Design an enzyme around this catalytic site. Structure first.
Site, mmCIF file in Angstrom:
data_model
loop_
_atom_site.group_PDB
_atom_site.id
_atom_site.type_symbol
_atom_site.label_atom_id
_atom_site.label_comp_id
_atom_site.label_asym_id
_atom_site.label_seq_id
_atom_site.Cartn_x
_atom_site.Cartn_y
_atom_site.Cartn_z
ATOM 1 N N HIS A 44 0.816 -1.204 0.000
ATOM 2 C CA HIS A 44 0.000 0.000 0.000
ATOM 3 C C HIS A 44 0.862 1.271 0.000
ATOM 4 O O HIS A 44 0.572 2.220 -0.729
ATOM 5 C CB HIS A 44 -0.915 -0.035 1.220
ATOM 6 C CG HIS A 44 -1.913 1.078 1.278
ATOM 7 N ND1 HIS A 44 -1.906 2.035 2.273
ATOM 8 C CD2 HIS A 44 -2.971 1.369 0.483
ATOM 9 C CE1 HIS A 44 -2.913 2.872 2.081
ATOM 10 N NE2 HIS A 44 -3.570 2.494 0.998
ATOM 11 N N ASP A 85 -6.334 1.812 -2.040
ATOM 12 C CA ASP A 85 -7.087 1.589 -0.815
ATOM 13 C C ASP A 85 -7.922 0.311 -0.902
ATOM 14 O O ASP A 85 -7.980 -0.458 0.055
ATOM 15 C CB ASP A 85 -7.976 2.790 -0.495
ATOM 16 C CG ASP A 85 -7.173 4.021 -0.041
ATOM 17 O OD1 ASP A 85 -5.935 3.918 0.160
ATOM 18 O OD2 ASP A 85 -7.788 5.092 0.115
#
Ligand code: NA
Ligand code: NA
Length: 118
Positions: A44, A85
């Site tokens: 991420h 996300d």
């Protein structure tokens, strides 16, 4: 935005996102990942590192839920942030089997810091 990411994490994992994921392992909220969940954060962070057009923290994007998956609106200018996300929230869900609460209090000194994580 971070506020949307938290919503995604809450629905994907059923856990309170701040307590459970804002400070986990060596990569969440920040070295070599300590486990699979920490690796989700590693990925991420790198994903966020490729975003150029929007603020990853502050800009909101558009998404929906369809048949258990997050679907990012392709027309939105911050869709790349949404994809980052979506991926981390889904990754957290897919690694709840090895999630360990003890990793929230993980000492930063124990993290073996690498030079090229991405
Ligand atoms: Na919780
Ligand atoms: Na929806």
């Amino acid at each position: 935005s971070l506020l949307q990411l938290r919503k995604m994490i809450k629905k994907m994992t059923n856990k309170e996102p701040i307590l459970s994921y804002s400070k986990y392992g060596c990569n969440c909220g920040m070295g070599k990942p300590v486990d699979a969940t920490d690796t989700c954060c590693s990925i991420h962070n790198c994903c966020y590192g490729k975003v150029t057009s929007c603020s990853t923290k502050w800009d909101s994007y558009s998404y929906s839920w369809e048949n258990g998956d997050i679907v990012c609106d392709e027309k939105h200018p911050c869709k790349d942030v949404c994809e980052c996300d979506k991926a981390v929230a889904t990754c957290f869900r897919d690694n709840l089997d090895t999630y360990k609460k003890r990793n929230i209090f993980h000492p930063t000194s124990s993290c073996v810091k690498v030079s090229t994580p991405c």
